[PDB]
Symmetry: C2
Subunit: 188 residues, 2 copies
């Protein structure tokens, strides 16, 4: 399951990480179509040149925030689901017919989840510097003549939801670091 | 009358100047509404901002070529008409009841006509450098956002007529200089 457990997960990996993951899922569900639903259609530019709106939008939004967060959530949930599948497979094999291997697998899964969180946060920072979206953008790309003034839709609400998602991801990274440190200390 | 005579006008002031003046009048008549008729309406810009076309047109055409040439022709014809009126007044006075004063008046009239020709040519050069009109103009003036691409109507035909009018005005200036020099030489 999401942020799955393996009989080795502590309190900060069984109680808090699952809550944060569910919170992110619910926020993404309630903001996916309400806020970013008309990101493309409501996006208009101040020009008479045909085809300038689409090229400007693709220039300023290479990949939307909602879909980037969706990919981040899917890739974060993948290692936990893989670990759960492996645990079920091992149980089935034992029934048809070990703790240290499971412990190391869980540690590697937490490490990979932390790595995915960090890389997705870095990608988000690289694509969209800052936490705020501006109402007006200046675009100079073919076929738009010189510079044109495009207007983004709902910058303030998108900024609020971006702050929420970034804070949640930072909390997830902190909790993953704490979980890794706690497991290392307990093992030694 | 136009480029009027005063019994003192030579061959280059009675035969050629009148022909050039009539040629300019006819060219202006046949090009006033045919070419510059839709200079404002056909003038369009590549923007969705309301009111940008009018401000751009006023920016790039402070005063149209046709009306500038009309003012030049009126001011050039004014001294000749004034001299003719003065001659008629003197004839009426003599009938109711002198050559040197008339000669000096004619010389001053030719000088003033030359001065008006020169000043109008200089003004035309200052407002519109070069002899050619371009199809595309870049305009950055309020309320137009940044720079906009405006398109002029009939640049080639207007260039041809500008060349015609400038050549005619240059010929007029040369003939006026020749007339002044010839009168000065004959007097001395």
């Amino acid at each position: 399951l999401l942020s799955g457990v393996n009989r080795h997960s502590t309190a900060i990996g069984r109680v808090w990480l699952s809550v944060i993951f569910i919170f992110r899922i619910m926020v993404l569900v309630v903001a996916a179509e309400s806020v970013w639903g008309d990101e493309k259609s409501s996006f208009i530019c101040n020009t008479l040149q045909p085809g300038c709106n689409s090229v400007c939008y693709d220039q300023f939004f290479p990949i939307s925030h909602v879909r980037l967060w969706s990919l981040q959530l899917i890739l974060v949930s993948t290692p936990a689901l893989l670990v759960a599948m492996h645990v079920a497979h091992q149980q089935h094999i034992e029934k048809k017919m070990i703790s240290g291997t499971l412990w190391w697998t869980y540690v590697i899964s937490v490490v990979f989840r932390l790595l995915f969180e960090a890389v997705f946060m870095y990608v988000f920072y690289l694509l969209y510097p800052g936490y705020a979206m501006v109402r007006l953008v200046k675009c100079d790309v073919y076929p738009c003549p010189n510079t044109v003034d495009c207007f983004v839709s709902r910058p303030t609400e998108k900024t609020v939801f971006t702050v929420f998602m970034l804070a949640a991801s930072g909390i997830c990274i902190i909790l993953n670091v704490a979980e890794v440190v706690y497991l290392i200390i307990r093992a030694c």
